[PDB]
RNA sequence: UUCCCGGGCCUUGUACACACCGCCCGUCACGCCAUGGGAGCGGGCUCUACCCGAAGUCGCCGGGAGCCUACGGGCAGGCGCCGAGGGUAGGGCCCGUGACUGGGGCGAAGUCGUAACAAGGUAGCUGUACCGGAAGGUGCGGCUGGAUCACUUUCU
RNA sequence: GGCUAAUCCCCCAUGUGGACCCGCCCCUUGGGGUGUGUCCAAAGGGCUUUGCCCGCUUCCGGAUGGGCCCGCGUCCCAUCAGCUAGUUGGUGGGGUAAUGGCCCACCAAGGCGACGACGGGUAGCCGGUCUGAGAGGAUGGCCGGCCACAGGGGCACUGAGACACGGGCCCCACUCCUACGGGAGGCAGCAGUUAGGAAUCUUCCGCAAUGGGCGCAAGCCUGACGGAGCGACGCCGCUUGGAGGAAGAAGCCCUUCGGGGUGUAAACUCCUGAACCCGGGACGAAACCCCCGAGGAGGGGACUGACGGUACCGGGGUAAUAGCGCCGGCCAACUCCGUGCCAGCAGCCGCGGUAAUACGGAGGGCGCGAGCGUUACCCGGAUUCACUGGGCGUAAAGGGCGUGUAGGCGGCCUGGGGCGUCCCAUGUGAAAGACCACGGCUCAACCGUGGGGGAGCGUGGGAUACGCUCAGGCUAGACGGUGGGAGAGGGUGGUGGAAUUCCCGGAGUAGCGGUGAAAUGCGCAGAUACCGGGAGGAACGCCGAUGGCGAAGGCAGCCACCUGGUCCACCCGUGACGCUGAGGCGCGAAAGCGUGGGGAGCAAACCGGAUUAGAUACCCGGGUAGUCCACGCCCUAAACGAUGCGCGCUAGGUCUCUGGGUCUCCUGGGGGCCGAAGCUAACGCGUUAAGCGCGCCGCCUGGGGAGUACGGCCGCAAGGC
């Protein structure tokens, strides 16, 4: 079975982005959908939608890329350069308000989860709430 | 390794063995000489070098090199020794400080006196 | 153009790079250190059983063998449990010395040989078994870390 | 033995009150209230004496300090695995301020332990210190907090408080006195001595300040302390001069013999004036006390300075210690001479055997400075034990494989709880130190003030996304049903053919065999070759492969029986029932061992023949164990795909095994090859990952020594872990 559905999703995204695929399918969940909402708000993706494959619910995530480039290796620059899960099964990463990191000098974002719901780093900073650190994306 | 493995077994702290068994964190050691010899060096070089068998107040008995152009060392001579080794002469883990006890400093060395234990010569 | 000598091109293998007149293995002999087993003899600790057991609390006696008494008792003294310590026997551990003896490392390079790196000359490695001055040899099986289309013959 | 006073001891009364038994009420472990019964108090002294001061007795409470219990954290060795016997618990007693198995009887058999017990080694712990970007590592001296000890071992008294450093008792060692019967002594208190050692101080000044004990007070005591001295031991501050000075003295060192270098450096000129000589001389010191007032508040007066004639102020006033390491590269600074694998240097790579920028000296230069190097130790660089922050296809490292215990991890939706997690408030987080600001000694060091913080935990409250738990539900994971399929998967029993060897028979003759070439060997007791018959063992040619099965080892004629694993289809059933897996257990090639049987071929050892300098080998002729079967052991390997298992995602092309299908082709599972992206140090890997990620197990930290020594466990042994 899937050990970490989150990590599964994010890794699928990494893969699909590496091959410059159009969109990608991920198993449906509220958590995942919210994380993708955060991902869409900051514009790391074109967007998402709820779809149905076979007899099972899924989520279509449409990736996002840049303009065509010059010289050898025409492949465009990744909008998402690096994305990695932080909290894991067997090791849980929990940060307080003053423990909340800052990604790439503000050039990138951090996805957290609080009692007020799934938030970004600056959102959790302004609301002044700590929680589980899900992953880092820049 | 997995995190749980580090929870159980954990990392191992590397130790360090002393290259100077004068024990007692010893900066130096006082000892009485046994013999005074000349030891042939290993393959890389060829020479006649002056070493000595020294019994120590620590109870140890070890070989020690004798720096300087010349020296005076008898059988029962009293000698203070210091750390540091001699590579071209295997088996010698210690150095002999000159200018201390029965070991006199080298005569007429005007460049570096400190390590060879010579006093400042008279003025011009 | 099979073979002897010199040489060239392509390829293949190499643990060679003062470059096969190369590198490299081991027994034994010589030089120098450290170490194991270890009878035996000293020393230390600990454990059990038994025995001896000071001081001191606690406990009993404290009586026509002692002292004070308001007769209610108290002190002295006596006995006893524990007990520091000591002894015996047995068991175990550590530590010193130790005849004899096992192997090792380094170095100076001698000795018998050619083991391994080119198919290193019987491809090698290997676990195991046996044998042999030594490297090793061979049997069973396994591995590709094996070349290639398909007499023998040392060393520098 | 005798006299005697008291805040010494005792007896009686006084019962504000308290103590104890029993009862009741409230509260909830032994807290409080209350009733009867019983029991308990005591000290006087001085006065400026008939009124105050000091002190006493009982009770309650505060303040301070402390005892005991508990949660959590607290080094190394698993070659220490079982440990415990008042040990674990209970009843009743003893003891204490109080719980306790602290102590003692009786009963029960419990208690601890891979989450590391017990044992061994090591070590006072902490606030902090050092280092480091950080995490962390190391350390625990000075100051401060707690603990433990007071020559070694043990025990009680006194008392609020000790199991008592300058108190007591005994045992032991040592020293001293002894009239030999016996006693005295305890610097890990200050200083000082001795011994050890590389090494650490004056047998100092003082009660002025601070603090402590007693006292109404005056005051006494105080090696606590305040000071001084010694030691570049550390940090900081400062001086050895400042300026004017020739293309540039001498001396010395290089030299193309022209010159260059030391270098404005020095002489000299001028100026300033550390040291020293005088004069003045401090803060730290105003309280206790006395006077007024009231012995309060308030006010007033007086005494007291170890440091010390020192800090400092004012005047006078001399140009007056520089040394140490290094100079090949790391690493900044170069030449001459000497030396000749000599003498020697060295932290690493290394230098030196005739012209050495590495040794020695000289000139010069660089670094630092009242200091400069060496040794030892700690962190660092070192991401080289990697949480941040590493690895295991060939460099070190995948466990031989499976099963599965503990443990670790958890598919989709709804709800409750709020343990984790997050937020607010509060308590703690002492002082010093560290950070910031101001200030005091001429600055700094140092000191002062104030400010700023802080993880961790306690308490109260709030949040519910994730983790957790409970309640319920879904079906993509997994299991199962039904219907099909392949396969050397494994066990038992039976059976078939070819061939080798031996026996029997027929026929048949001069050799066969074997090598590079020969010989040993077999043959006239008739072989080799041919035919027929019989015996027996062991292995299964073609099919057959780049093939298939199994978890690994491994599995190959065929029949039957017993039995495991596995693929596909039908969406049928259960409803997260899952993944991993320390230890344990089972399996485990070949060799080897034990017992028994069997033995054709093969073949270690061995018996021989050739070859060779030798041949204990390769070649050849024989031939035992063994190879085989039954049972019981042995646990090893290049047990290798040198790649642990499970899942998800990430171009394809080509060959193949097998299952299904509307069967050019699509699909599901398995085995190969070339290869997108990507990864890799390269080779190479590449939907069978070594790519992108997750969960869990095992394992690695330079080579040799050595998979050895010793220990333990397993085995009959060899040996293995
Ligand atoms: K050509
Ligand atoms: K190679
Ligand atoms: K009597
Ligand atoms: K009463
Ligand atoms: K007082
Ligand atoms: K007053
Ligand atoms: K001068
Ligand atoms: K030379
Ligand atoms: K030089
Ligand atoms: K030099
Ligand atoms: K270091
Ligand atoms: K292995
Ligand atoms: K196969
Ligand atoms: K590449
Ligand atoms: K074994
Ligand atoms: Mg040499
Ligand atoms: Mg050294
Ligand atoms: Mg030729
Ligand atoms: Mg040509
Ligand atoms: Mg070539
Ligand atoms: Mg040759
Ligand atoms: Mg007794
Ligand atoms: Mg007694
Ligand atoms: Mg008595
Ligand atoms: Mg010995
Ligand atoms: Mg060979
Ligand atoms: Mg060989
Ligand atoms: Mg050879
Ligand atoms: Mg051969
Ligand atoms: Mg060979
Ligand atoms: Mg070979
Ligand atoms: Mg072999
Ligand atoms: Mg042989
Ligand atoms: Mg073989
Ligand atoms: Mg009397
Ligand atoms: Mg009353
Ligand atoms: Mg009453
Ligand atoms: Mg009374
Ligand atoms: Mg007890
Ligand atoms: Mg009781
Ligand atoms: Mg009690
Ligand atoms: Mg100690
Ligand atoms: Mg201690
Ligand atoms: Mg670091
Ligand atoms: Mg720091
Ligand atoms: Mg001290
Ligand atoms: Mg003493
Ligand atoms: Mg008292
Ligand atoms: Mg005490
Ligand atoms: Mg005392
Ligand atoms: Mg004393
Ligand atoms: Mg001495
Ligand atoms: Mg005083
Ligand atoms: Mg005072
Ligand atoms: Mg000049
Ligand atoms: Mg001048
Ligand atoms: Mg003046
Ligand atoms: Mg003047
Ligand atoms: Mg008056
Ligand atoms: Mg006053
Ligand atoms: Mg330089
Ligand atoms: Mg010489
Ligand atoms: Mg030098
Ligand atoms: Mg020269
Ligand atoms: Mg140097
Ligand atoms: Mg580190
Ligand atoms: Mg890691
Ligand atoms: Mg590494
Ligand atoms: Mg390897
Ligand atoms: Mg394996
Ligand atoms: Mg399993
Ligand atoms: Mg389980
Ligand atoms: Mg979950
Ligand atoms: Mg769970
Ligand atoms: Mg909670
Ligand atoms: Mg707080
Ligand atoms: Mg503080
Ligand atoms: Mg200031
Ligand atoms: Mg402060
Ligand atoms: Mg709370
Ligand atoms: Mg809620
Ligand atoms: Mg449920
Ligand atoms: Mg079926
Ligand atoms: Mg079969
Ligand atoms: Mg037979
Ligand atoms: Mg016949
Ligand atoms: Mg014959
Ligand atoms: Mg005949
Ligand atoms: Mg025949
Ligand atoms: Mg398979
Ligand atoms: Mg295999
Ligand atoms: Mg269904
Ligand atoms: Mg259902
Ligand atoms: Mg076996
Ligand atoms: Mg066998
Ligand atoms: Mg057998
Ligand atoms: Mg037999
Ligand atoms: Mg012969
Ligand atoms: Mg043979
Ligand atoms: Mg044969
Ligand atoms: Mg296929
Ligand atoms: Mg396939
Ligand atoms: Mg394929
Ligand atoms: Mg490929
Ligand atoms: Mg590429
Ligand atoms: Mg390449
Ligand atoms: Mg190992
Ligand atoms: Mg080593
Ligand atoms: Mg080693
Ligand atoms: Mg072995």
Curated annotation (Swiss-Prot), chain A:
Pfam families associated with the record: Ribosomal_S8
BP GO terms, sorted: translation
Keyword line: Ribonucleoprotein, Ribosomal protein, RNA-binding, rRNA-binding
GO molecular function, one term: structural constituent of ribosome
GO cellular component, one term: ribonucleoprotein complex
Record-linked PANTHER family: 40S RIBOSOMAL PROTEIN S15A
Family: Belongs to the universal ribosomal protein uS8 family.
Function: One of the primary rRNA binding proteins, it binds directly to 16S rRNA central domain where it helps coordinate assembly of the platform of the 30S subunit.
Self-association state and partner proteins as the record states: Part of the 30S ribosomal subunit. Contacts proteins S5 and S12.
The protein, known as: Small ribosomal subunit protein uS8
Organism: Thermus thermophilus (strain ATCC BAA-163 / DSM 7039 / HB27)
Gene name for this UniProt entry: rpsH
Curated annotation (Swiss-Prot), chain B:
Entry-annotated residues carrying 3-methylthioaspartic acid: 88
UniProt-annotated stretches for the region Disordered: 105-124
GO biological process, one term: translation
Pfam families per record: Ribosom_S12_S23
Superkingdom of the source species: Bacteria
Keywords, comma-separated and alphabetical: Methylation, Ribonucleoprotein, Ribosomal protein, RNA-binding, rRNA-binding, tRNA-binding
Family matches, as InterPro entries: NA-bd_OB-fold (IPR012340), Ribosomal_uS12 (IPR006032), Ribosomal_uS12_bac (IPR005679)
Molecular-function annotations in GO: rRNA binding; structural constituent of ribosome; tRNA binding
A single Gene Ontology CC term: small ribosomal subunit
Segments of skewed composition (Basic residues): 108-119
Subunit relationships: Part of the 30S ribosomal subunit. Contacts proteins S8 and S17. May interact with IF1 in the 30S initiation complex.
HAMAP family, alphabetized: Ribosomal_uS12_B
Purpose of the protein: With S4 and S5 plays an important role in translational accuracy. Interacts with and stabilizes bases of the 16S rRNA that are involved in tRNA selection in the A site and with the mRNA backbone. Located at the interface of the 30S and 50S subunits, it traverses the body of the 30S subunit contacting proteins on the other side and probably holding the rRNA structure together. The combined cluster of proteins S8, S12 and S17 appears to hold together the shoulder and platform of the 30S subunit.
Family statement drawn from the similarity comment of this UniProt entry: Belongs to the universal ribosomal protein uS12 family.
Protein name (database record): Small ribosomal subunit protein uS12
Gene source species: Thermus thermophilus (strain ATCC BAA-163 / DSM 7039 / HB27)
Organism placement in taxonomy: Bacteria, Thermotogati, Deinococcota, Deinococci, Thermales
